[PDB]
Write a protein that binds this DNA or RNA. Structure first.
Lengths: 75, 48, 1138
DNA sequence: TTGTGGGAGCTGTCACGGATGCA
DNA sequence: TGCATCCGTGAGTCGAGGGTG
RNA sequence: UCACCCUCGA
């Protein structure tokens, strides 16, 4: 693991980035907390100040819209 | 104290001592990035 | 002239003026004799009868006789091993090298047990182990790699006296060491004050009277024998105690610390250490040395090899009488022994342990451990249930043999660049190793050429580096004594006549006689015409003596020379430095796609090639039945078929390709011993390490300045110096903590185009051309997901990836390496194959590259003239002869005279004479210059092959004569005048060069040092995990070490920022490296350096030594040296769009 | 937790200043 | 308690390849 | 990659 690999590892994917930017910020933060950071659903509802229904609805809807946004799948 | 093969175990003092200790080998001079080596051939074409 | 002792060998006309009365023995005999002795093969049997050593006893048989019998402490039961026997080999050599095995044969013994109580006998045949076997080429195969056992130089057992001057006072103190083949050492010394004492096992020196009275002597008895020595009388006057039993008890307390003294255990230990044959091994060589040195028992009493009380008395009397130094000394039973100190480097006192003795010495230890196990079993086991099978545990013997062949210093990776390298490697003599002197004990005086090395060890061939004088090649005519000495043949001179009776002499027997020289005037009958000849003195000093006193004469010149060194033409015209470099550089030459025998050589190419073992030879006279590129089948006059398979494009240990090509056609009649097919560097049976090139000796526009070399581009276009280089790549899929690795074409996040050269397995396909970074074997490894990417965990959590979480560990091509995939072999755990634990699959891909000659490649001749290629000009730029023939290689003039290698110039002259051929005019002929040597060298057709044997080569007058009768070219022009020079035309401007330049044909070798191997570059790469500095080595993609002296230079320049940048942001600053790469990538300025991580490692190392180290602020207290983890989260959360 | 049983290698290095330790 | 003797330290730089523990 | 050892190169 060189300094070259370490410096390029820091840069964003700029493909998953764009696809996430296309998602609604309300659903983007939800899929972030529940998937990237892996919070429990109640704790995500605690962080976003919104109840459980809102959180899980944004969760699955943003999941679907992101699924439709990216087809690369590591090619 | 000899490990299998009767070689003397490198002690905490051996890490500092000698030309291969920390001071000589790893502190006074080190291996660097952006460096290479190769065989040298004469070029009379070149300027100084 | 003809050298017709070898059938079918090409006719190399020899300038030799002297007949060869003895022929070069088997160059590998130093190895085969040793191993055939160790086994006891019938070849070795027959040999012994001839030797007259009627008592034949093998090495294994000897270890068995020393071990037998094995008696229990009660004496009730004994176990004796009787007969060693070998089952056939387990696998052939090729299969061993392919499957990473060891070429071995099962070893059986006949273990007879006897119970004296019940008086019962149980014989058996017990399996000792799989014994590694020596090949027909004299090598071994260990774990799939070919290896050679180097003969070790060790001092023979015996007593050795030395004169130690340079005490505190200018007073000669004499010391003596009694050194056995095994046991406890003995040492007798004298001090600054006059005394005599015995230093035993490094213990403090006790007066020798203690040992005298401990062996039973009384004061009245020892005072008699040493009465003429007042030093012994003074030591007895200064003696602490006088008595026998108290001497025993004091010797005991000297041997025994921390435990109470006792007289009974004193007697037992003192009698067991030396005179008991168990703990003390006096060698047969050692008994012979001591019985010749002290002359005590000369009436053939070899019945027992152990110290006799008379020989200790003789050693002490010798020590004390050596202070007086009277020549004749007579032990009470001894015989007129000369009293003199012993030379440690003399080859009469310095023997060599060959491979058989080293293997025997490891087997002895293993078997002694097995004997311990046998004695342990003899108690706990129920009698009437034991068998010789249940007593014997062969684990320590197998472990001993494995440890030897794997880790011993004397078991060396075989060096095979060309046949010659392996040939000499098998004949090397190494002074370092276990049982010999260590590396820090090697002084200048052990490395120098000893006068006893004449005809035994070559003084020219030896390493240039730190191993100088420590590794030396065995001479050509020398052979190893059964005792381990080196003998050299001579010619017995009776009544001043020289007969054909050859007598081999050791260094001991030689110094009694005065030896003549190989170059000597001889009456047609045989006698010296010169009044006084030059000879080697017993002292070794040269002198003059008449012809009736000469006892022996050299069998031949080159007697003192090794194989590789005797292949240098006009060696006698080169200095030992450049001759050494030439001998060492011959065996560094790579093989070429086709091998061209040298136009000018010695008689050693043929013999060295066929003895090297890389050539195919006919074992029996017959006619070739079939010839293919794959094999050659011959039909003997017996009617029996014999077939030889060709080694085709097989990689050697060093990467040089070893091809074999048939030199015979279908239907040819071959005599036994003829060469059937050439090896890598052989040509029609002769060693060809390079090419015959047209050379011009002149400085050319500075491109050959300071040892560089200018080449004709022809040598590229015509593949003259092109060589094939094979390299092996290996990768294995194993079981990790996360699961098992898989070798598969399925590689995530990879294009189909780069995978196009891979089969369904993920392995590259045979015949594809590979470039830097091309995938050789696809391999995926289960990823722990702890380092999994947050943006990738997004994918795994949203898309529900379940089955395969892997990463790309696939094998790729290293930097700067490219070629054509030759072969692929694969081993699978799914199939039946032996693989290490956890390793599922293991695949090897072989890749060959055709390397043309190029800038930087290393060329050298046989005369120590080296150099890299500065430039390769087009065939037009090269200076050309009058007929338009461009020279092939331009060697700078300034390099010849100062280096004292003028054999290259004579080689060039004779090479032109051999290229164009010559016809000496013989109408009223026999010109006085050509009368002496030339027999049928009078005329020679163009491109003839001739030989100049070292010290018998063509004389200067004969070469100057040949330079005149040079045959013209096809146009009738004589292109090279009688001066060896010629007019050359500058191929650039066209004007001819004003002066005639020496041109000719020189043998040039491509040494194995190529730019394709040596070029390296690293912007960034892997680091060592401990000190965080860049790794080292081209293989590891390492960086260059900027050492201490380089920092001294940088400081002397006063360049501070360069020194800091080299030492902080390029090497050890973990946060500065990625910062610098990021800054340059984004085109910004370079930031400020941080702290070297190795300094933190130093501080932690000091803290681990109970040293409280603290970095203080300007005025503050200790400063926190580590960093918080929250510095890296902001930019990550921002890149994810928080 | 029985009755039996004393290691492997080395050293073929040299020069110098100082504390150790012997007599 | 004055002095020999034994002990500890030091002994060029930078490269390449192989093996085994 | 860590440690040895070996054989080399200037």
């Amino acid at each position: 693991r060189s300094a070259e690999v370490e410096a390029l590892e820091a840069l964003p994917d700029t493909e998953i980035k764009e696809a996430l930017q296309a998602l609604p910020e309300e659903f983007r933060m939800a899929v972030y907390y529940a998937d990237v950071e892996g919070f429990p659903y109640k704790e995500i509802a605690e962080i976003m100040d919104t109840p459980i229904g809102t959180v899980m609805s944004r969760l699955h809807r943003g999941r679907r819209q992101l699924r439709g946004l990216l087809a690369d799948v590591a090619r | 104290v000899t490990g299998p093969g009767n070689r003397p175990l490198k002690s905490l003092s051996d890490l500092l001592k000698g030309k291969q200790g920390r001071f000589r080998q790893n502190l006074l001079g080190k291996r660097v990035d952006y460096s290479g080596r190769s065989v040298i051939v004469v070029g009379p074409q070149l300027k100084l | 002239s003809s050298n017709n002792s070898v059938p079918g060998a090409p006719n190399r006309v020899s300038f030799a003026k002297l007949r060869e009365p003895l022929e070069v023995p088997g160059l590998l005999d130093v190895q085969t004799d040793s191993f055939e002795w160790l086994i006891g093969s019938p070849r070795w049997r027959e040999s012994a009868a001839e030797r007259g050593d009627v008592n034949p006893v093998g090495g294994l048989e000897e270890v068995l006789y020393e071990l037998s019998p094995i008696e229990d402490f009660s004496g009730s039961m004994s176990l004796s091993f009787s007969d060693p026997r070998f089952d056939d080999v387990k696998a052939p050599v090729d299969e061993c090298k392919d499957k990473d095995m060891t070429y071995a044969a099962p070893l059986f013994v006949t273990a007879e047990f006897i119970n004296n109580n019940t008086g019962e006998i149980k014989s058996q045949t017990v399996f000792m182990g799989d014994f590694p076997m020596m090949t027909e080429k004299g090598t071994f195969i260990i774990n799939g790699t070919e290896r050679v056992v180097v003969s070790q130089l060790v001092r023979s057992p015996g007593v050795y006296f030395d004169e130690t001057i340079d005490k505190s006072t200018d007073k000669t103190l004499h010391s003596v060491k009694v050194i056995p083949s095994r046991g406890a050492w003995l040492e007798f010394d004298v001090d600054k004050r006059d005394t005599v004492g015995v230093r035993i096992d490094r213990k403090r020196r006790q007066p020798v009277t203690v040992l005298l009275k401990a062996l039973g002597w009384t004061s009245e008895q020892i005072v008699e024998r040493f009465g003429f020595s007042e030093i012994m009388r003074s030591t007895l006057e200064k003696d602490n105690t006088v008595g026998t039993d108290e001497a025993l008890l004091d010797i005991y307390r000297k041997l025994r610390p921390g435990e109470p003294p006792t007289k009974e255990s004193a007697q037992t230990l003192l009698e067991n250490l030396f005179f008991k044959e168990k703990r003390y091994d006096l060698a047969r060589v050692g008994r012979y040395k001591v019985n010749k040195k002290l002359g005590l028992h000369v009436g053939e009493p070899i019945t027992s090899s152990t110290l006799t009380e008379e020989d200790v008395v003789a050693t002490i009397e010798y020590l004390v009488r050596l202070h007086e130094g009277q020549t004749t000394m007579t032990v009470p039973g001894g015989v007129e022994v000369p009293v003199e100190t012993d030379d440690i480097d003399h080859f009469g006192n310095r023997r060599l342990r060959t491979v058989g003795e080293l293997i025997q010495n490891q087997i002895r230890v293993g078997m002694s451990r097995m004997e311990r196990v046998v004695r342990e079993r003899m108690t706990t086991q129920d009698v009437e249930a034991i068998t010789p099978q249940t007593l014997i545990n062969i684990r320590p013997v197998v472990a001993a043999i494995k440890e030897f062949f794997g880790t011993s210093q004397l078991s060396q990776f075989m060096d095979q660049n060309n046949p010659l390298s392996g040939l000499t490697h098998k004949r090397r003599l190494s002074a370092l190793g276990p049982g010999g002197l260590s590396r820090e004990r090697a002084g200048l005086e052990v490395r120098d050429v000893h006068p006893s090395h004449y005809g035994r060890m070559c003084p020219i061939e030896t390493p240039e580096g730190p191993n100088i004088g420590l590794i030396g090649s065995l001479s050509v005519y020398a052979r190893v004594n059964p005792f381990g000495f080196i003998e050299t043949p001579y010619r017995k001179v009776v009544d001043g006549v020289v007969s054909d009776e050859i007598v081999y002499l050791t260094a001991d027997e030689e110094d009694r006689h005065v030896v003549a020289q190989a170059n000597s005037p001889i009456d047609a009958d045989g006698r010296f015409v010169e009044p006084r000849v030059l000879v080697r003195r017993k002292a070794g000093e040269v002198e003059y003596v008449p012809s009736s006193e000469v006892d022996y004469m050299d069998v031949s010149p080159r007697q003192m020379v090794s194989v590789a060194t005797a292949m240098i033409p006009f060696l006698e015209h080169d200095d030992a430095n450049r001759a050494l470099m030439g001998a060492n550089m011959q065996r560094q030459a790579v093989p070429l796609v086709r091998s061209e025998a040298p136009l000018v050589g010695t008689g050693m190419e043929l013999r060295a090639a066929i003895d090297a073992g890389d050539v195919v030879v006919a074992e029996e006279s017959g006619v070739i039945e079939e010839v293919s590129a794959d094999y050659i089948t011959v039909m003997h006059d017996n009617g029996t078929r014999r077939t030889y398979r060709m080694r085709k494009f097989a990689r050697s240990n060093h990467g040089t390709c070893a091809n074999q090509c048939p030199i015979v056609d279908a239907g040819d009649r071959v005599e036994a011993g003829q060469v059937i097919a050439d090896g890598p560097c052989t040509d029609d049976g002769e060693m060809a390490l390079g090419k015959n090139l047209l050379v011009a000796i002149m400085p050319w526009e500075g491109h050959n300045y300071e040892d560089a070399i200018i080449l004709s581009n022809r040598l590229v276009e015509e593949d003259v110096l092109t060589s094939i280089h094979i390299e092996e790549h290996e990768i294995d899929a194993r079981d990790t903590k996360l699961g098992a690795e898989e070798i598969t074409r399925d590689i995530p996040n990879i294009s189909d185009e780069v995978l196009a050269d891979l089969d369904e397995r993920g392995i590259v396909r045979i015949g594809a051309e590979v470039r830097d970074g091309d995938i050789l074997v696809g391999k995926v490894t289960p990823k722990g997901e702890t380092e999994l990417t947050p943006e990738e965990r997004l994918l795994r959590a949203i898309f529900g990836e379940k089955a395969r979480e892997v990463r790309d560990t696939s094998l790729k091509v290293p930097h700067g390496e490219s070629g054509k995939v030759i072969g692929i072999r694969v081993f699978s755990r799914e199939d039946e194959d032996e693989l290490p634990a956890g390793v599922n699959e293991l695949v090897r891909v072989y890749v060959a590259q055709k390397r043309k000659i190029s800038d930087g490649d290393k060329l050298a001749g046989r005369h120590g003239n080296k150099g890299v290629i500065g430039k390769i000009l087009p065939v037009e730029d090269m200076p050309f002869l009058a007929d338009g023939t461009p020279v092939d290689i331009i060697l700078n003039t300034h390099g010849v005279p100062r280096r004292m290698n003028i054999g290259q110039i004579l080689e060039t002259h004779l090479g032109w004479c051999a290229h164009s051929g010559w016809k000496v005019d013989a109408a009223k002929g026999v010109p006085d210059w050509a009368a002496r040597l030339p027999d049928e060298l009078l005329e020679a057709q163009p491109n003839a092959i001739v030989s100049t044997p070292v010290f018998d080569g063509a004389q200067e007058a004969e070469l100057q004569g040949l330079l005149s009768c040079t045959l013209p070219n096809r146009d009738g022009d004589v292109l090279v005048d009688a001066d060896g020079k010629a007019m050359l035309f500058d191929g650039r401007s066209g004007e001819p060069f004003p002066y005639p330049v020496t041109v000719g044909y020189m043998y040039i070798m491509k040494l194995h040092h190529l730019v394709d191997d040596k070029i390296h570059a690293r912007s960034t790469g892997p680091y060592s995990m401990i000190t965080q500095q860049p790794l080292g080595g081209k293989a590891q993609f390492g960086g260059q070490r900027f050492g201490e002296m380089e920092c001294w230079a940088m400081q002397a320049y006063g360049a501070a920022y360069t020194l800091q940048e080299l030492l902080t942001i390029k090497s050890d600053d973990t946060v500065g490296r990625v910062k610098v790469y990021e800054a340059i990538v984004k085109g910004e300025n370079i930031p400020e350096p941080g702290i070297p991580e190795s300094f933190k490692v130093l501080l932690k190392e000091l803290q681990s030594l109970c040293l409280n180290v603290e970095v203080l602020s300007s005025d503050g207290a200790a400063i926190e040296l580590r960093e918080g983890e929250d510095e890296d989260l902001e930019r990550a959360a921002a890149n994810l769009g928080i």
